[PDB]
Amino acid sequence: KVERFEVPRTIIFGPGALEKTPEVIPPSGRVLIITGKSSTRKYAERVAELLKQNCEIISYDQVELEKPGFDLVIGIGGGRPLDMAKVYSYIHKKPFVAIPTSASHDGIASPYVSFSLTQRFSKYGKISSSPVAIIADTSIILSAPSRLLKAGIGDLLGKIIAVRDWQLAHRLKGEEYSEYAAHLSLTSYKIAVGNAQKIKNFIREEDVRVLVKALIGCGVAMGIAGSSRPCSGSEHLFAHAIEVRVEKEDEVVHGELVALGTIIMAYLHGINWRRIKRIADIIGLPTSLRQANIDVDLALEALTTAHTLRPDRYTILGDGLSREAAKRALEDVELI
Amino acid sequence: KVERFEVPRTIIFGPGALEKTPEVIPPSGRVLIITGKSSTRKYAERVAELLKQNCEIISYDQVELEKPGFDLVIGIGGGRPLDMAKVYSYIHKKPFVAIPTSASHDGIASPYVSFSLTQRFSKYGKISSSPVAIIADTSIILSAPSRLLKAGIGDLLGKIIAVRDWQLAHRLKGEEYSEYAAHLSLTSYKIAVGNAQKIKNFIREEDVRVLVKALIGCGVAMGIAGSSRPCSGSEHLFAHAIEVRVEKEDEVVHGELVALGTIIMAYLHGINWRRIKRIADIIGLPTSLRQANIDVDLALEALTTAHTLRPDRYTILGDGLSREAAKRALEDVELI
Amino acid sequence: KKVERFEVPRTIIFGPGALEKTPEVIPPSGRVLIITGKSSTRKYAERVAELLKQNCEIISYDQVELEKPGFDLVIGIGGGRPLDMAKVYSYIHKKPFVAIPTSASHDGIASPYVSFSLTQRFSKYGKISSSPVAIIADTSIILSAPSRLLKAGIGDLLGKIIAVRDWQLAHRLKGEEYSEYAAHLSLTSYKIAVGNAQKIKNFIREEDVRVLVKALIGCGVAMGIAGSSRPCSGSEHLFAHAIEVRVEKEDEVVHGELVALGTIIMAYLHGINWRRIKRIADIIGLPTSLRQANIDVDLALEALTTAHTLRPDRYTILGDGLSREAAKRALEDVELI
Amino acid sequence: KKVERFEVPRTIIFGPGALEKTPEVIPPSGRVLIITGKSSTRKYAERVAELLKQNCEIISYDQVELEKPGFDLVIGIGGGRPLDMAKVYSYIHKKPFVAIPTSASHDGIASPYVSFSLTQRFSKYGKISSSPVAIIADTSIILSAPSRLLKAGIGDLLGKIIAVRDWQLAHRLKGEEYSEYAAHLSLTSYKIAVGNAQKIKNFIREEDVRVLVKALIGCGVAMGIAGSSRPCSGSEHLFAHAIEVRVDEVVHGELVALGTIIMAYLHGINWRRIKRIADIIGLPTSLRQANIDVDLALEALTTAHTLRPDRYTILGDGLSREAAKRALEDVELI
Amino acid sequence: KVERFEVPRTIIFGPGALEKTPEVIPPSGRVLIITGKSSTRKYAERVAELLKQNCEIISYDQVELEKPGFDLVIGIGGGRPLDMAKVYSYIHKKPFVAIPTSASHDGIASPYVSFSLTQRFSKYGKISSSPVAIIADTSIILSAPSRLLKAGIGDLLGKIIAVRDWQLAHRLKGEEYSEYAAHLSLTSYKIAVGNAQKIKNFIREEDVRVLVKALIGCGVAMGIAGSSRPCSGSEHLFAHAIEVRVEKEDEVVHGELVALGTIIMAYLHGINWRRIKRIADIIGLPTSLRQANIDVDLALEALTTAHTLRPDRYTILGDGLSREAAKRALEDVELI
Amino acid sequence: KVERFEVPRTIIFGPGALEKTPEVIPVLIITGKSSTRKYAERVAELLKQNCEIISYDQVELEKPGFDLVIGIGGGRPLDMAKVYSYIHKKPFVAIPTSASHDGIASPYVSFSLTQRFSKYGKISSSPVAIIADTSIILSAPSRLLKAGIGDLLGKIIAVRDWQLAHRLKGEEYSEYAAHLSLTSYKIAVGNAQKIKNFIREEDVRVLVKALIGCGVAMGIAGSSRPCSGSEHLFAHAIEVRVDEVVHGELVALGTIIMAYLHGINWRRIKRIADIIGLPTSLRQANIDVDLALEALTTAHTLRPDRYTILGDGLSREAAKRALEDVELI
Ligand SMILES: [Zn+2]
Ligand SMILES: [Zn+2]
Ligand SMILES: [Zn+2]
Ligand SMILES: [Zn+2]
Ligand SMILES: [Zn+2]
Ligand SMILES: [Zn+2]
């Protein structure tokens, strides 16, 4: 039967593209500008001058999601404000404009909210908010720690696993599948390996224009697929199961964990994992648990429980990676 | 240097998609519906009924592209009414909704019109009109003529030359190149070569799905590239060189010419042209000039001048194919 | 850390006339029981009795008294049925078993294990497992078995690609013991089966039968090295077993045909080349549709959705269960319905 | 068209403290001859006397009267030398043989064959061949073995790639009987020997010894299925045997490893990959390191094809002196 | 060990290159023109017309080799007259000029006479006459039966085995070896496969140009090796052993036998015989003994005895192919 | 139509091959003004006929009156002899005392020197014999030999540029010459590690036989085309802007760049170029970046009748990116 999806209609790319955001706002109604914490306020303020629209700027933690009376919602910052804007957008049925400030994740253009253990927004229904436009100011994005930008490559790497898991789940459990969305996800995976050596450093914006487009493409894949399955499988379960067991997320980064998870899940899938390490090193991502200061026993506890995080999502983890099996995996792949 | 690009906002795709047309049409506006002159007339009438708005049906060959008066332009039919709708949309700066009832080439989702029309109406400027929406009803597309459906796969075969030529122009001339766009174009090519055997008869809706998917993918690639580069190279130059030299563009089938050009330019590029020809025969596409009823002296004129249709764009053709080299190429690839 | 014991068949004798050398593996003293079949296989048991100066009991498998003690040696002679029953009796009393296959239906001719149904039926005795100390495969006799059941020997071999792939997965996921030795042996039988299927499939010459028999014995040695049926049985055998316990009588289906069908299906689920395995099965004349095999769609779905529950300790591609919807899609895509 | 018979070891008891299960593979009655070494291996023999309800007769290979009758079962307990003696005795008197390797120096711990040299001395009797009815490899014990000899185990395994290549050649050229089952089993032992060499070379932990012993047993199983030593012995072993009849100064596995390197060169394959692996283990990779006189190695290589004329290898008619001289140069063995 | 060898000094290629032969024959001195039979005279007679020098024409079977008084000798025709001219050249230390009318053999530029069971020419010593120049008129050569030009390619297919046989002989027997000679030989093998598909029809005078230059380079290769080892091994032994046992050479042709030999010898070497059989079919060469009209007992006899034809040359046949093994090879490679 | 080519009649090759020189000749002997004069003398002893030894500087070429031209020394005495050999109908023997250049065995003179005596036309003088003493070619400056492998590496480009020129512009092409040229290329790469050292004897033989192959290929082909394409247009472009660079090191640099332009595996060529100890950067090669950019943007104009992947020219902006993306900068 009939599939339908949305794509960001307008995408502005380049240095000081933040200046151009008025081009993509209709000259109509009031504008909620959701922002991050804490250094994203310059930009969110920066924006508000350029618009003849009256626009209130609430930080994501202070947003009254049910409060109507806004005709458009911008979101600016990282994952948190962007999700929050998506939720606002969905509840009120209003256009959403994404203005990412960092590229470490693939939600940038996904209509879906990030995975949440407590299910922060389950109350609001099946949220689907494909941004009507994306302002990708490469200068803002660029001048960010090289850690968090090289990690965004790491996130791309996991798409080889996520597609496999999703295919498996389709064949074993009948989960809805889209051949195209999977190809689209791998298009973005194939970009990350083909331009691996090329952009590892990030001296120029030309390097992150490739990154961010590739992440944006993953977002649209999820949109076609109907969920994050094309871009997030066992390798992200690994990440999610770690970052739930750290005190502060501050002491660990998603895209590294994803990249580490990818090495592990490649081994479990019985595909070439040696190579994915070879790319990970070349990018400068940690290819060892110790290198990421991840405790051996923390990994084993995550690995052996990750199949329970998302019970309606089947991966190569199947029923449970056993402890003894996870120990050995870490060894053969050399994380430990 | 800051670049901005557009792609379709909404894509509704599958058996019966025409019935969901109003979902993408603003509640206010008077609508111009451009269609063809026979089989396509009923589909336009069907859409006129669905809309709750002021609208007007008119054959592509009765439109006065100068007269003003419509807020929204729909193109419904084969490549020709969609093309004319795009010109109208460009001229009067109005939104465009593409409703392909066939799948002849990559025109169904792109912002560009044929080469002939780009020339004919170049008084108005460089025609370009990204559709806000694409309604791709695969049940309606199934009933389209099978020669044209096959020709659509032909259009897709060219993308391997288009990308190589583009990469060549990037490395040798500094032409702007988009990694993402190119990969996305190559994905559509791999889909085409991968499913050609299976889909070529177009007896099932599932055959159409695969073709239309890949074609839309190419339209979008052109959107992201900001040019036809990812989907048009030296193989298209050949096809255009033939298209301008006929009295009417309907003496010729675009995809068929592109398929012939692709065999030729693969040879010039030094890759495996025999593979391409083999796929082209499997599909039922003409693989000699005689099979396509194209005259050899005309083919030679086209080939020797093809580099002058777009002399700002470098391709393997460089500053031109010599006539004996042209002749020899047609001979080696067994086109004559 | 743990001490491991493995049993492998000691003496393997095969070729034309091999029945005549049976006495070379029968100890001088002792009381011998000979379990054989109901009709045709009896003459071959009689023959074996003459070579031992008739000092043994002969019985057909359906008339064995499993609690009867005092025998020193049990010999199975016939098709899979009496070899199964010989293994059961052999296990109950902890006596040496000698396999004298008269047919080459499946790898049972050389493994320690018996049919899934029989293993359940007599579970009160333990996990039935009798590794034959000796195998005597007369290829001229085996040449005379039914063509359908000989082709089914090949079908049983086709499943080894799936079983090894399921075993590897189980190793990586559950840390279950794995032996490259067992696996490479079992995959060699697989290799030889597909490689020679076109040539041997009619089994009109002793050489054709020789190929099949050696591949089945190789599997038997593989299971011995492994300490389990893992190298020769996986998710494809689960499908077979799930059909086998649900049928009114054994002979309504043939094990090796079911293995072949399940091999196509599980190959689809593993995402490997099922098209290639299906072609090989059509070359042999093995059923490649539920219709041909005389299996009701509903029985096959119930079987596909529950097969993972038959041996829960045994991880396969089936995970924690193939859904009905997914089972139906696969049947469709592999053209078994 | 002939009937064929194959013997494979029936029971394989493998692991730490496996020696204690010995009574499980020994029959209820019958005289038991235990043959063992003369230094360290006696205590291991001694325990078997205990564990075995029955009186048995512990005796060194040094002192075995071969023609002396009197036993229903022969155990060989120790390294290669008592196990060979046990198989000869067993072959002579037609009695079941149990292999209880205390070391793992070569694939003789699970094969039915004895050293080439020994096969000659007792050729009077026929081809000495005793397939062990059972194998009891206690990896705790085996770990106490000379590292040098354990390392030589991996040496003996390095030859299998050649033995199988010679076997495949003989099959295609001479029509000699071939078993893919035996071939792939022997190559698995090889694939594993190389894959784990660096990891297991030191033999400090049971893990190490277990992978070596498994790979040797596999080889034994391969020889049983094939009904010959073809899976585990080709031109590399021919080279080794030719040295072994001209000198216990040298070690079997070391010789096989050197031969392997040379026969890899002759076969046109990757001798460097093999030599790399041999040095990684710490096996002699030169005539100098090995203490083999060049003229003796040359005599060996030029005559090696005459030891078993019935079995074709890459040596064919005979390697010429110049070629053998060249060979040793190219592989930097001299 | 200082090495020396000769290479044809002057080579002349094209349509009517026979008209240019007086170009490569010094002005003074008497010229022997050794011709084949029977219709070969027309070419020798024409060369005599163009020659200012006094010159006798003699059928190769009427040549008195020991008769001096000729300053230069021309071989014109097949392998026999050319070999006869090589012997003359060597006996008298006189210039040899080669004029091949066929391209069915690698003798054209070879210093050495072909294999002979009877040892026709052994009395004259180690014959080595690299022609000083070659006159390769592609018109006359293209004028050969289509069947026999195809065989010429077959001859080139054997070189992959000859080199392996040679390497094996160098390694096991210390036979003299030349890496460069082996490579030049393979150069011509790769050209055979590289251009197999296209040139195999021989419509074009340019198809034959490629063939003959391949055959010539094999010639030179033998010169560098100091013998024919690098262009003849076990595959040629099969051919020769068949040629020795047939009643009439016409009954079978040489190149087809080499190609068949090559398939068998590849199997024995344990390399990809399928690849070679595929290329042989594409060329149009026989790939079964039935297709070549060859008794199976004949082929078995040839195979089992071929190791004794040239006992100073070692090959994969080594000590001898057993009858059972030779039957199996024939089955396993589907020649029977 | 019909064409004829020449290749060397006799080739003497190995340790002490220089003593067999009387074998090949039935005299002018052009040498240098360097350590090469040593061997120019070591020969005239063993020749019955009179020999005027006279180095390329003092060589006068209008003047006839010699029966045979012998080139002994580097690439330049060899090329002068070819020149001198072309003007008069006199045979050329080539006695290379070094292995830096493609044309030790080639009938064509360097591009630089072809443009000097263009009064007589394209010079083509295939040496009737080649004496290649491997023992002396060791004592030749060591890096100059190292380069030779480098000069070899450019053939993969030269062959592809040539095919392109054939298929696009209709230039004459020889399958055989191309495959022969390519075999030389595979010899260079295939042994670069095992011969990297230049310690063993064969380490000179492998290079020299590969180079000779090319000369022969050029002869067969009737042009430098199988051995000189766009990678060489780079080298020739650098060479006319100076004498502080080795020809073959440039060719190797050009090969990396042109491999990148062509879309093939320039990294693989980069790996191999390192092993030999060739410059894999303009810095490493002591090359002013401005120079290299002008070389790269101008090189298509050197031989306008010779099409390559350069087409009608590399843009200044693309040249810099190219340099940067292949890490030459
Ligand atoms: Zn992520
Ligand atoms: Zn098009
Ligand atoms: Zn079974
Ligand atoms: Zn050994
Ligand atoms: Zn020939
Ligand atoms: Zn050069």
Nearest CA among E204, E249, E7 for reference residue E108: E7
**Nearest-CA distance E321 → chain D (Å):** 5
Nearest to D317 among E268, E318, E324 (CB): E318
| Method used to solve the structure | X-ray
Q: C65 CB near a chain D CB, below 8 Å?
A: no
Q: Are residues C258 and C288 in the same domain?
A: yes
Q: How far is CA D267 from the centre of its chain?
A: 22
**Where residue B68 sits, what CATH number does that domain have?**
3.40.50.1970
By DSSP bridging, strand E10-14 and strand F3-6 are antiparallel
Name which of C4, C10, C187 to mutate to probe chain D: the one with the most chain D Cβ atoms within 10 A of its Cβ: C10
Nearest to C188 among D12, D14, D184 (CB): D184
Nearest CA among A178, A185, A179, A101 for reference residue A145: A101
Q: Are residues F145 and F273 in the same domain?
A: yes
Note whether A172 and A235 are within 8 A (CB): no
Instruction: List residues, by chain if needed, whose CB lies under 5 Å from ion ligand 3.
Output: C 106, 156
Among left, alpha and beta (phi > 0; psi -120 to 50; other), residue D52 is beta
Backbone angles phi, psi at F208, to 5 degrees: -65, -40
List the strands of the sheet with C32-36, edge to edge.
C56-60, C32-36, C73-78, C97-101, C134-138, C11-15, D4-7
Helix (H, G, I), strand (E, B) or coil at F268: helix
Place of tokens 């764009």: B313
Secondary structure letter of residue F265 according to DSSP? -
By DSSP bridging, strand B96-100 and strand C4-7 are unpaired
Chains sharing 3 or more CB pairs under 8 A with chain F: B, E
- Alpha carbons E329 and A241: distance in angstroms, whole number: 59
For residue D262, give every residue at least 6 positions away whose Cβ sits within 8 Å of its Cβ, in sequence order, or none: D236, D239, D271, D301, D327, D328, D331, D333
Backbone angles phi, psi at F94, to 5 degrees: -115, 120
Note whether C90 and C96 are within 8 A (CB): yes
Nearest CA among F10, F198, F179 for reference residue F98: F198
Cβ-defined contact of E9 to F12 (cutoff 8 Å): no
Name which of C98, C181, C212, C223 to mutate to probe chain D: the one with the most chain D Cβ atoms within 10 A of its Cβ: C181
Note whether F315 and B314 are within 8 A (CB): no
Angle at B84 between CA B82 and CA B89, to 5 degrees: 90
Nearest to A2 among B15, B191, B217 (CB): B15
For residue D239, give every residue at least 6 positions away whose Cβ sits within 8 Å of its Cβ, in sequence order, or none: D255, D256, D258, D259, D262, D263, D300, D301, D304
Q: What is the CA radius of gyration of chain D?
A: 19
Note whether B26 and B52 are within 8 A (CB): no
On chain C, the residues whose CB falls within 8 A of the CB of A322 are 173-175
What spacing in Å lies between the alpha carbon of A171 and ligand 1's midpoint?
24
Residue A303 tokens read as: 């690995």
Name which of D2, D10, D216 to mutate to probe chain C: the one with the most chain C Cβ atoms within 10 A of its Cβ: D10
**Nearest-CA distance C262 → chain D (Å):** 25
Q: How far is CA F82 from the centre of its chain?
A: 14
Place of tokens 């592809």: F160
Residue of F nearest to E18 (CA): F2
On chain E, the residues whose CB falls within 8 A of the CB of D320 are 172-174
Q: Are residues D6 and D139 in the same domain?
A: yes
- Alpha carbons A28 and A5: distance in angstroms, whole number: 25
Q: Are residues C195 and C227 in the same domain?
A: yes
Q: A167 CB near a chain B CB, below 8 Å?
A: no
Query: Which H or E run includes D158?
Result: helix D147-158
Note whether C294 and C232 are within 8 A (CB): no
Other beta carbons within 10 angstroms of residue A327's beta carbon come to 17
**Per-residue H/E/C for chain A:** CCEEEECCCEEEEECCHHHHHHHHCCCCCCEEEEECCCCCHHHHHHHHHCCCCCCCCCEHHHCCCCCCCCCEEEEEECHHHHHHHHHHHHHHCCCEEEEECCCCCCCCCCCCCCCCCCCCCHHHCCCCCCCCEEEEEHHHHHCCCHHHHHHHHHHHHCHHHHHHHHHHHHHHHCCCCCHHHHHHHHHHHHHHHHCHHHHCCCCCHHHHHHHHHHHHHHHHHHHHHCCCCCCCCHHHHHHHHHHCCCCCHHHCCHHHHHHHHHHHHHHHHCCCCHHHHHHHHHHCCCCCCHHHCCCHHHHHHHHCCHHHCCCCCCCCCCCCCCHHHHHHHHHHCCCC
Q: How many domains does chain C have?
A: 2
Secondary structure letter of residue B246 according to DSSP? S
**Nearest-CA distance F306 → chain B (Å):** 13
- Alpha carbons C236 and C283: distance in angstroms, whole number: 20
Q: C69 CB near a chain A CB, below 8 Å?
A: no
Q: What is the DSSP string of E56-117?
A: EEEEGGG--TT----SEEEEEESHHHHHHHHHHHHHHT--EEEEES--S-TTTT-SSPPP-S
Note whether D103 and D128 are within 8 A (CB): no
**Nearest-CA distance F164 → chain B (Å):** 7
Nearest CA among D53, D58, D62 for reference residue D71: D58
Helix D206-226, helix D147-158: angle, nearest 10: 40
Q: What is the DSSP string of F38-100?
A: HHHHHHHTT-SS--EE--TTT--SS----S-EEEEESHHHHHHHHHHHHHTT--EEEEES---
Residue D249 tokens read as: 């100064």
Going by the annotation, the residues of the binding site of F for substrate are: 102, 151, 236
On chain F, the residues whose CB falls within 8 A of the CB of E8 are 7
Helix (H, G, I), strand (E, B) or coil at F13: strand
Helix (H, G, I), strand (E, B) or coil at F129: strand
Helix (H, G, I), strand (E, B) or coil at F225: coil
What spacing in Å lies between the alpha carbon of A223 and ligand 1's midpoint?
15
What spacing in Å lies between the alpha carbon of B255 and ligand 2's midpoint?
6
> What are the angstrom distances between the C-alpha of A15 and each of A48, A107, A132?
19, 22, 21
Q: How many residues does chain D have?
A: 334
Nearest to C8 among D9, D21, D187 (CB): D9
- Alpha carbons F71 and F34: distance in angstroms, whole number: 14
Q: D306 CB near a chain E CB, below 8 Å?
A: no
Which of A 13-32 lie inside 8 A of C, CB atoms?
none
Q: E321 CB near a chain D CB, below 8 Å?
A: yes
Secondary structure letter of residue B30 according to DSSP? P
Among left, alpha and beta (phi > 0; psi -120 to 50; other), residue D319 is beta
What spacing in Å lies between the alpha carbon of F33 and ligand 6's midpoint?
22
> What are the angstrom distances between the C-alpha of F84 and each of F12, F108, F121, F217, F223?
23, 12, 13, 22, 19
Nearest to D175 among E170, E174, E328 (CB): E328
Touch D-E: 3+ C-beta pairs under 8 A: yes
Query: Which H or E run includes B240?
Result: helix B234-244
Task: Say whether C105 counts as a known binding-site residue.
Answer: yes
Alpha helices in C39-115 (DSSP H): 41-50, 80-93
- Alpha carbons E289 and E274: distance in angstroms, whole number: 16
By DSSP bridging, strand B96-100 and strand B133-136 are parallel
> What b/e readout covers D98-133, taking b as 16+ CB neighbours within 10 angstroms?
bbbbbbbbbbbbbbbbbbbebbeebeeeeebbbbbb
Nearest to B318 among F166, F168, F170 (CB): F168
Q: Nearest 10 degrees: CA dihedral of D323, D324, D328, D329?
A: -30
Residue of C nearest to D205 (CA): C1
Angle at D144 between CA D141 and CA D147, to 5 degrees: 135
What spacing in Å lies between the alpha carbon of A144 and ligand 1's midpoint?
18
On chain A, the residues whose CB falls within 8 A of the CB of B180 are 187, 191, 210, 213-214, 217
Angle at B47 between CA B41 and CA B52, to 5 degrees: 140
Cβ-defined contact of C326 to A268 (cutoff 8 Å): no
Note whether E180 and F212 are within 8 A (CB): no
Cβ-defined contact of F9 to E9 (cutoff 8 Å): yes
- Alpha carbons C335 and C70: distance in angstroms, whole number: 53
Q: Are residues B91 and B187 in the same domain?
A: no
What spacing in Å lies between the alpha carbon of D184 and ligand 4's midpoint?
17
> C220 is in which domain, residue-wise?
145-337
Resolution (A): 2.5
On chain B, the residues whose CB falls within 8 A of the CB of A205 are none
Backbone angles phi, psi at A254, to 5 degrees: -50, -55
Nearest CA among E41, E1, E58, E50 for reference residue E23: E50
Cβ-defined contact of B4 to A15 (cutoff 8 Å): no
- Alpha carbons E221 and E5: distance in angstroms, whole number: 10
- Alpha carbons A249 and A16: distance in angstroms, whole number: 30
Cβ-defined contact of C322 to A172 (cutoff 8 Å): yes
What spacing in Å lies between the alpha carbon of A51 and ligand 2's midpoint?
41
By DSSP bridging, strand D32-36 and strand D11-15 are unpaired
Note whether F76 and F97 are within 8 A (CB): no
By DSSP bridging, strand C32-36 and strand E72-77 are unpaired
- Domain end point (choices A113, A143, A173): A143
- Alpha carbons E149 and E135: distance in angstroms, whole number: 18
- Domain end point (choices B84, B108, B143): B143
Q: Are residues C230 and C291 in the same domain?
A: yes
Q: Are residues A104 and A149 in the same domain?
A: no
- Domain end point (choices F97, F113, F139): F139
Q: C170 CB near a chain A CB, below 8 Å?
A: no
Other beta carbons within 10 angstroms of residue F111's beta carbon come to 17
> What are the angstrom distances between the C-alpha of B158 and each of B185, B229, B313, B328, C236?
10, 11, 16, 21, 44
Going by the annotation, the residues of the binding site of B for Zn(2+) are: 155, 236, 254
**Where residue A217 sits, what CATH number does that domain have?**
1.20.1090.10
Note whether E162 and E188 are within 8 A (CB): no
Nearest CA among C148, C139, C152, C161 for reference residue C213: C139
Q: Are residues C191 and C267 in the same domain?
A: yes
Q: Are residues A121 and A253 in the same domain?
A: no
Nearest CA among F107, F195, F184 for reference residue F152: F184
Helix (H, G, I), strand (E, B) or coil at C14: strand
Q: Which residues pair with A6 in a beta bridge?
A: B10
**Largest separation between any pair of C-alpha atoms in chain A:** 63
> What are the angstrom distances between the C-alpha of C221 and each of B217, C216, C228, D10?
54, 9, 11, 10
Secondary structure letter of residue B270 according to DSSP? T
Q: C191 CB near a chain D CB, below 8 Å?
A: yes
Residue type, F122: K
Cβ-defined contact of A322 to C168 (cutoff 8 Å): no
Note whether F77 and F55 are within 8 A (CB): yes
Secondary structure letter of residue B11 according to DSSP? E
Among left, alpha and beta (phi > 0; psi -120 to 50; other), residue E29 is left
Cβ-defined contact of B172 to F318 (cutoff 8 Å): yes
CA atoms within 13 A on the CB side of E127: 26
For residue D26, give every residue at least 6 positions away whose Cβ sits within 8 Å of its Cβ, in sequence order, or none: D32, D52, D73, D98
Cβ-defined contact of A172 to C315 (cutoff 8 Å): no
- Alpha carbons A18 and A120: distance in angstroms, whole number: 30
Helix (H, G, I), strand (E, B) or coil at E144: coil
Note whether E272 and E288 are within 8 A (CB): no
Nearest to F167 among B170, B319, B329 (CB): B329
Say how many Å lie between the first and final Cα of chain E, rounded. Answer: 48
Q: Are residues F10 and F128 in the same domain?
A: yes
Cβ-defined contact of C326 to A173 (cutoff 8 Å): yes
Nearest CA among E138, E134, E112 for reference residue E223: E112
Nearest CA among E280, E164, E175, E171 for reference residue E230: E164
What spacing in Å lies between the alpha carbon of B261 and ligand 2's midpoint?
11
- Alpha carbons A202 and D38: distance in angstroms, whole number: 71
Which parts of B44-194 are beta strand (E)?
Answer: 55-59, 72-77, 96-100, 133-136
Note whether D220 and D111 are within 8 A (CB): yes
Q: Are residues F20 and F80 in the same domain?
A: yes
Q: What is the CA radius of gyration of chain C?
A: 19
Q: Are residues B286 and B231 in the same domain?
A: yes
- Alpha carbons C185 and E223: distance in angstroms, whole number: 50
